[model samples]
Target: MADPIDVAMRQCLARRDRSSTAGQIQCMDEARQQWQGEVDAAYQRLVKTAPADARRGWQESQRRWLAWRKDEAHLVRAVYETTQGTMYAMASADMRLQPVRERALALRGAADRYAQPGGGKGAVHRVRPCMRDAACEHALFDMNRYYEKLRARMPADSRQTLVAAQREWAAFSDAMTPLVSEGERVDLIGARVATLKRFSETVNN
Candidate 1:
């Protein structure tokens, strides 16, 4: 069966005239709203389905995530202070939605896994290298995609700053990945994905 979210996103893109700036922005806005809804719904599901002992941590994580999102948005807005354009506005909105989208999907995946019979902490699941490898690859893909898009949209003067930030992040990831377990590496990548998405949303207003 086709994923409803994917289907909706495809429809959103198909309806937009990607050749025109306004058309592209319009489609992006629609897709962003859709993903936002998915994020909210997934979050609620995680809260409801979490074990009693885990509920507090999940709630705290949500609070922290929201705070991080707000701070990142402020940073993006600050960077683009002197710029103005529909593309930047659209990109900002796109960036804002992506972190939520990724988090929502990740939470949903966790919820689904735990929902199965004999699932949860009691289940001694076998860990696999391929899983971590796949996640790492996906994380890199998202990071590069957002990096390219943001670099293209940013003013020439600010481009080097983004490059520096990415270089630092890559270095940090390289230093840290080996110290953590595979699961932790996935979490680290996921966090980076969120960070990159938020930064991608900056636009001159």
Candidate 2:
């Protein structure tokens, strides 16, 4: 079987190629929503699994995490918009785990040059794909997305600082990869749907 990411992307591309724009958008939106739900669940888990000290520092962490998350959100949105906007961009896009690693490296390079964290030190961050035996692409994407949201709260004054922070985040993300299970992915995605349903219900509520 094709890897889930490849499978999903291929299917989405297929739909895009054959269907009307609105139809393609609908298909993508549905798929994205499913992934979004998994991510939301993962977010709650990350918050729960965080160290007590980390939780104590939640206010500060949240500030930093939000910013980290925004970048991630941008990435998620970018994947959708880019893929939908043009086939070339989609063909060149990096939605897989390896690409994420590469992008982080590139971003780290940019931050090192621009942010100038005192002493001008450049840091390397490592991210590995979740062991195939361990989790599915859904889990990987969920965890990746969750970390992005959590990272959004942290703020960096310079590109170097941000890159360095991402280095830490890479470690953090890798460490937690094992915690997410297929059951957990299902639950998280369900919770996400409920959250959205509630949002829709609010119009009546």
Candidate 1, 1-205: lDDT as tens digits? 7557657766766663564667666666776677778778877886787665445545655665565555555556655565578756766666666666766765677567657765556322233543358877787678778778777767777676666655655554444343334666677677776666655564442
lDDT agreement of model 1 with the native: 0.62
The model with the greatest TM-score is 1
> In candidate 2, which residue ranges exceed 4 Å CA deviation?
1-18, 54-65, 68-85, 88-205
Q: What's the TM-score of each model vs. the native?
A: 0.58, 0.29
| Residue 117 in model 2: lDDT | 38
Model 2: per-residue lDDT, tens digit, 8-119?
7458758645476555544555555554444444444434544443333332433443455455444333323323345433332323222233323322333334334342
TM-score between candidate 1 and the true structure: 0.58
* Root-mean-square deviation of every model: 7.5, 18.3
| TM-score between model 2 and native | 0.29
